[model samples]
Target: ATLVDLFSRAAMEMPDRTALHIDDEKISYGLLHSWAEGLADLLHDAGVRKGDRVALRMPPGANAIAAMLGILRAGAAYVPLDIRNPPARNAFIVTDSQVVALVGDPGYTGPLVTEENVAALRDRGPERPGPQDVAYIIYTSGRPKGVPVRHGNVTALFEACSRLFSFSADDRWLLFHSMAFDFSVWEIWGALSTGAELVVLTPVETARVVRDRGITVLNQTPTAFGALTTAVLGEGIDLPELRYVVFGGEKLTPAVVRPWAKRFGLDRPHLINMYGITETTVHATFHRLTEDDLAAEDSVIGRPLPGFTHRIVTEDGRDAATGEPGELWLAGPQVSEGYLNRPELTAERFTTPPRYYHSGDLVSRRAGGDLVYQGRADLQVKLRGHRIELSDVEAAVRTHPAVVDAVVWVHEFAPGDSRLVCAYTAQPDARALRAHVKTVLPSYMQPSQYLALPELPRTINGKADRASVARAFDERR
Candidate 1:
């Protein structure tokens, strides 16, 4: 069974209860069920079948949720495309997924599902999705790749989390992330699987939803939460109903949550850190915050959740000793089958026999069994919760005909505020290159500073020297 199976049981149990809260509108589980059913019936009528793929590019609301559930009910995989992203970028994913139908994407000339048609929908839906059927295809950084995760993979995540969390029907959970982002997988399922209520938050209206709707659970990225902590503390906003603040998507240093910890003291609204990747099925490790953690300097990522087995390997292929840093290799039911359309990458990253993903993360285990996350071993980075490859941006920059070669990197001005910076051998037209980049990439992936150089600064080995490049930019300033 898929997530829909669990949600169907809840909807049957609590037909009159609110399943979703959107702005001034509240959708009962009964109403939500009928809407998704109606959508599935529409898909069935339109020749959509089991094993087919459906695309979603809708604004976040009741409609998006219904469409996602409807897609699953039809026994088809749902591929989420960010509506904010460049049309070209979305086009690539659409072609890659080869979806039979699209929901909310106006540009799609093929079979489309919109709010108007769906509003009047009321039909039957559900093909009894098998556990192995792919649930969703989410794209990530580097050639903007896609990972297809199974229904079993997602259900396993919630089952493992249920052992540690008290998610219930009474809890009002916030759907704060973009459906395109994998963290939203946890947010959406974490609520629906447990019969909890989900509130669709208005972007930038974060405090209002939490305060007004009495949102009990809030999932956050450490980078975003840092700014949120500053805003809430500045305004003296006190959220009495919020009982949980779960952190994921990126690394969580103790210092980032210190101010909030000092004010709230980690009691009522407990802080929890989850370390995960898109390929690991949203999250792999969990750690509940405490006083010792707030004071400690290490980025302590406690332990892997029940289903996963952990291994840390050094350069020589042996397990690292306590306090030794190495690459993290994970094997579990929750790990994704592999990348979509990129079998070469899948074979490279996922090992055989008993397959384990090469996480590309650098870390060390403490003597007591808790692991401290150090950093990445590769050029890939987690910025504001989005995993990006320096090469991805470089590829985007190099696409400009005037550009010769480019190197892209994360430049952090302060603790949590980071931006993409590109050093390129170009025609000195920064504006021209920036405009070209915006056409091919999303707003987040665009370079903040496009510094033109006749040639990239080189080291003794004649390799592009990153430190020398930074110093050259400074000298130019």
Candidate 2:
């Protein structure tokens, strides 16, 4: 069940159907399939064989997707570089993935496949791959390594999701996330594998793209959707063809989505909150938002998709009770083995027999099978003998009507003197937010400082950049 195999099966049956729509260009499945074959042929000619890794550094568009399919078609895993990242960052990823060739813009420039020539390539038809072979390697910001997700891992993810979703050839899916991010994997393959049309565009104004392109299936992070909610609500722009708006990558809270639900109401286009990690393909658990959920404060991520199972363990190594919080551990065909070249981490975070990936995320179980996401374990910090969850503070701060988004961290006034500091993007009155937060958070959980900005800084993947936000907070102080 390689991605290429799944894609080819879907494409060959409906060769004349539109596969991808980007601006003025609408590429048919027949044309897209031919382009992928051409790219695969090019890689094979350059000595790229099964299990080899190739780097892709082009901008997010049709050509980049073609190149990815091409790499996989030749049985090579594609490593996508964040085009917006610094050269040093991508250069490091290239070396870490041990790519045999570079597609699009090259850092080391070995066995290069130029971006300009990929579209004109003719199909030579050379295909070979293993289902368990690595399909792509996602490089992380350190713990320093790439996570190798296999072809089977991805196919299993979709197979599990298929039991719940009826996404089909009639649907039009939006490829909104950058290729470097794993979210794109779901967007691209979910469309291609299910015989749906994938709409690819470099985002400027998101709501417009949804309206103008008649995009039916949209996937995004909570942060990105909050921005879209602002535009859609402000302009009163109704999305006619928009069917499903899926939220992942970042935590989905009632505060982030309440405005949209309150305005549009979730009847035609449903909102689904999916919790995931890069190690577990893209999504592990899914929850469709209800009118009741729009009023609740807690983040409820419902049951694991069919192929997945999870366990929550306490700090003491025992399984946590029904409602007690613990670190989440996931086991499934969708979970990747381990990070590339990091055997120590692999041993520490993963177990072989009855395989499980130890996700360092804090979660509690509800009365039903639904999972309540507490926060990231690494985001917890100690201040004056109290263990404060920084995500809790951020969530509380974001609940204020004026506050658009928030980043929270423990600030040290000096040794033994620490307090919570908040940096946020907002609409009005930073002072008012201080009192607004006081009503929600306890004294100990309260933020000592509130730093407001027009826009919160973001990582290449479009989530809040915690390090940069903290750095800016310190500079201003």
Candidate 3:
């Protein structure tokens, strides 16, 4: 069945169940089904049909969720236009996606479709899309040039979760990611596939969802999870309904996990530490945490899910020996179809092999077949549970007039809690530097705390000594 049809199936099976809720407002399966079908009708009337492309540009809410489902129901692919992205970047995605129409709130400015038009369109006709048609495209930051590469065809991945996780109409999932990030692949469709209640949380409202809403299914970063801990305990709020947490977008260490489990009863909450890249459809490796797993130094990303295969290989084109660190490679239905419009890069990263995707992540396999994450083999680092490009941050800072040179480094203050890109440069204006960063990057990409040096430190080769620089900044912090 088509992606939207999955929701229709569920709606038919469980029409009385609540399917969507944002804060106090709630929409039952029957209501959501009709609303989505009505919007699909409008989309078909507005020249949208099978194979057409629609860009959804809106903040997180029930409306955005409806728009996403409506686009697929109408047989068009959706390019989620993250509204929080820089305007120039957001505009580029709309054009790059070749979108014929955009769906958004009345006041939204990034896309051409207005709220009034969406309403008018929804009142029209339905073209219910087919299953074999392309559903949506999720774009990742370019591997070589920092450009965008779009990936498609993840229906099988969704189907796997529908069966594996035992998704039920009883689950209320917390929508916790930026639409630009591909994590929404599961958050959006996973809920729909089961006709489960989806609780949409704005960036600010995520804390409330954790504390007040009694959300059950959640996919969030460890950093966000950490923050939720502080928020819940500090506010004295209770989340008795939180049943499962699947955290990715960064490494998970036992240090942080232990404290979290201690406070919330880890055994009680079914926690899974997932490891995957954007090139993968949300997840590739999964490790379910048992009480013993939490007692170790770190939890290994256990094994491949039903539709995937995993292997660890060394630099010599041979499989890495047991207990040796090697690049992680995966083959699965979830392995993404190559990047959009980037053939050369697509050939380089997504290769058919004894190992499929060269994750650029180094891992070691033990005698028991559990894989331990060593670290990234490249410059990609996870700060605050968000994957950050060091080059991306350096470019943003170099644009400042006071900055002669700048370098961003990830510092591991503790084993599992390491997140923070410390910048050291000739510039000394902390306030002005903070303001300067805001111009070119989002708040999340900005340094958690900025440290100034007279000038950047350099190695004998004249390159910045990033290792020592990060250590110094971490010490000071």
Candidate 4:
């Protein structure tokens, strides 16, 4: 069954049970189903047909959730555009995908603007689509070097998550991440699949709500995890019922995990580090944790779930020897069709999946068969729990009027601590530079600290000497 079918099942089995908790309002399964149907009707009246694109461009709330399931119920692919995205960036995705219509409560602000100038499209009835139909279009940071990938269905998403972490009737999932990030897909669909309660916490109230609530499952980034630790342990708060802490989109380091072990007992909560790209539907592999697993210097990424396969292969396409580092390859039912409209990139990154995805990640499997993350075999780096594309950040920085060129590198303050995206450019001043960037990029995409350099270093090949520039910043820090 598809994700929409799961919602149908939940509506029948536990109609009274709370299906969604957003802000101060909680919605039951019966109410959620009715609203979903109502919104689907609205979409139908608006001319949204089956396979038509219905975008949800709003914050986390009942309206957003309703839009998500309602679009699916209407037989249209749901494209979630976080209100926090750069307007230009969101516009690019919408133009690339060619969405016919979108459903939101009020003034819609996303890739599509409601103006009389654009193509006149209306939403009507949602046509029935198979499990293979598209679900959402999520963009990569374009920070380092990756573009956006579109996820069509959740076949692999349910298969992988359900295998490792079992969601039950009593489960309550805390939806912490924004809709822009791929993590939200799991929080929404995972619950839809397992009949669990979905909770959306605001950035201001998430800390306090998490402290008081008996949330069993959480989908967050390591940055959010670290911030949550401060709310719990550092603030002398407690959440005894929290059992599963599933984080991805950034590396989960010891600095973030060790504190919990010291305070609340790490053996108690099942901390899981999941790895996946937008192209793989949500996650490709997962590493479930036990007491013994934490003793290692670094954590293991574990193995792929059912219907999923991951391999670390050499540049020559041969599988690396056991315990030898190789690039990660992913092959699964959830693997996305490819990038939207970018045939060249689609052909380059997504080719024949011979039971593997070619993750571009560096890893080595130990004797115990646990995968240890070595590093990236490419030009990607993790900063603030989000993968920062250095080149992408540089491209963003250059958008500033005063900036001629920009170079960005991840700056790690301590082991496992979140890195700051530091950009070195020829901007005139800090205040004006930041103001200019805010007009063009999202908050997360902007560099936390900007370094003004008279001249950037370059190698003999005339390309910017990224390594030397990183070292220069390291010395300053």
Candidate 5:
């Protein structure tokens, strides 16, 4: 069954149950369903047909959620355009996706639905989109490689999750990520599928909501979680209601969560790290952290989720030995149906017969069955005939005594004269940091230059903006 069917069943079971809490507004299942149905009817009447793409651009709110469900119900896929992104970026998506109509924002010159018109629709019935129909399209990295996700993919993900974690209707969750990121898929559907109340909050209000609203499930990127832990610690805040905290989007560092684990005793709110990419839905591997894992340097991404199948392959397409690093390949129902309109690129990454996505990640499986992430295979650059994993250098820089976060870039101002530059957050002695990294990394791998910044710049999706970092470094020169 699709996620919408699951949600409809939940609405039937408990129509009066509170479905969402965003700021001062609280929406019940019955009212939320009514709003979605009403919007669906409006879209259907406005000529949205099966397989059509309807653009949705708005801030994270109740209306946005309703509009998405309404799009699905109207038998069209919702293409979420990040309002936080530049207007030109959003325009490209609308044109590329060929969105027939837009539900939010008037920036795009298409059939538009303003907020005022949305309020006039009365409760109507669903158009009932097919299970195979695309439910949404999310643009990864603001590129043209838009991932089209189907209803079956979403259903498979929720079904797999049912066996892993216990989600109750009384449980409260935080919808903390932007809709542009695939992580929001897990958060939104994870809540709707289980009938949990979704709580939306600003970054500053994270601690306050978890404390006041009794949030049980917390999901965040390691970068965001690091800041949250520091803020919560400084305020001496304790959230006994937090049952699980899932980390994703980037590499997980031990230092970021160690203080929180120490204060919370590591058992109160169980910590889980998920490793995945946009092409393979939200997550492919899951690692539940043990007490011993808290201090471990390398982040351990545990075994595959219920429906996922993974293999490590060398350059020759042979399977790697247990301890050997290779490109990770994933095959599952959750994998997307390749990028939209990029047939050649899709054919390059996705293999047929038994479909598998070539995850550009370099990883190795230990005898203990945990997958240890090495770095990105594509990001592995050759400097003077020596292959260098830039992530390794960045990881070493993070090990310094006074660094909170660090990003590394390699610049070749002249051919064969490449230099490694590091940008770091927090106060660290320049010579000491270089010496510290040199102790662990080889002399060739050590950064030639180091930069101290107040904080690393982040993309709209909350990842380290490597392009922006490189741009800043170039401007400095």
Candidate 6:
């Protein structure tokens, strides 16, 4: 029923089978369960009761994985904070979440529980949570806001995946993305639920780990997978063990995936492109790519996953015509309860006649029941699998004293691979302004290029003429 329960059952079924492998260290299901139980007991002693929140601020490893499971077992939601994120950002999250205890790292100014303390706990019985209880809260550039994910949402996701993929105990999945990203939810829990081996990979070890560990399930962003495929081909390394390769976060374009198709014969590794948002728990639609699909300029994002429903609505809330482009709306068991504390904002996005989440993506239905993804209907864009609000970037830039006015626009040199460009009316040091934004925002949100403009062009509505600026950039190129 619950994520922890699924894992507990797996551990009981196969105690000796390896559950996780990282850097030559192997942890069996029984050992992982024992570690999680001990940490849960320690957390219970530290005032982390049911419905409480615990922040995990350590790097990826066995300890972080154990701490997450332990938090779930203790009936508290785990809030993951990337150690690589700015301290200011982490502090804001801690203050906003009002966590009862901080685990794994001591940088946050909260009830700190260091790794030394976690290593000394004794195993105790867990205080499991109900299916409705919050399991984790992952942030997605809402300044200080976070999305609270319940156990039911994840259970539905795993169930949908089970119906789609042949995930068994023999599979080994690579945890390539950061825990802060929702994609990690599918990777981590998908492995644990199936009693499979989860191989944790570092930034530099993706290709090497897949080949050496014989990893089967590889889920990655198209950008990162492209780089890995190029490296593997150039080095002449063989990855005969790989079975499924799932892409998410950004679009899977023809140019980016062609290299892998050429190298792997386009059919060996089952290529699946999933389209999802954090609000929809991880993925809502699934498209298993084929050789013919890759031949086109854009790939088709097949129908919704089992138990998920989708509707393409026109601008006036009516259903769009066949093969017409409109905003995509999603509804299902996998949809989350909405934002953590902002009920007003939740009401605006999550409308309830049929109870569907308004996904800001624009899409068109094909003749064969597949959906073709058009660009975003708003300024929100996905860069490297992270959802970014252009307004958030502009607001961060305006905080600088030197900026008089600012507008941030994404420059698309290629599909799914773009950079943020800031056009500001400031004569300040470009480097200093860049550094100023880094203090307030994460590294990913920082502008890739800053343009010093005398004054931004205006449209008929007195708004910043973004198209004119982008056209200027194109002409300069």
Best by TM-score: 5
Tens digits of per-residue lDDT, candidate 4, 1-477, equal 566677788788888888888666678888778877766666677677777776667756776777677777777776666675557756665666677776553333433322221112211134555677676766663321223333334755675566477678788788776776677778777676666878776333576686556788877765567557756765677777777888776555555677777787765577888766777777777887666656765657777667766667887888899978889877767777777666777777776726345567788888877887765566566655677566556656776656756766666666765554555556278778878778777777777777777777653212466666777777776
Residue-wise C-alpha lDDT for candidate 2, range 360-458, written one tens digit per residue: 898999887789899888888877778888888887887776777889888667787777888888666767888888899889898888888878888
Better of 2 and 6 by TM-score: 2
| C-alpha root-mean-square deviation, candidate 5 | 2.0
Predicted candidate 5 versus true structure: per-residue lDDT over 359-427, tens digit per residue = 888899999888988888867988767888888888888877688889887876677577888889983
Candidate 5 clashes between residue pairs 3 or more apart in a chain or in different chains: none
lDDT of 3 by residue, 316-399 (tens): 878899988899888876666666677787788777744287788888988888888876677666666588877567667866
**C-alpha local distance difference test of each model:** 0.82, 0.84, 0.69, 0.67, 0.83, 0.82
Q: Output the worst ten-in-a-row residue range by lDDT, candidate 6.
A: 456-465
Where does model 6 exceed 4 Å of error?
122-124, 142-144, 202-204, 380-477
Using lDDT as the measure, which candidate wins? Answer: 2
The estimated TM-scores of all candidates read 0.80, 0.94, 0.75, 0.75, 0.95, 0.80
List runs of model 2 lying over 4 Å from the truth. 122-127, 142-144, 202-204, 412-418, 428-432, 435-440
What residue pairs are clashing in model 1? Answer: 38-123
Candidate 3 all-Cα RMSD: 10.3
Model 6 residue 316 distance off true place after TM-score fit, in angstroms: 1.0
The per-residue C-alpha lDDT of model 5 at residue 348 equals 86
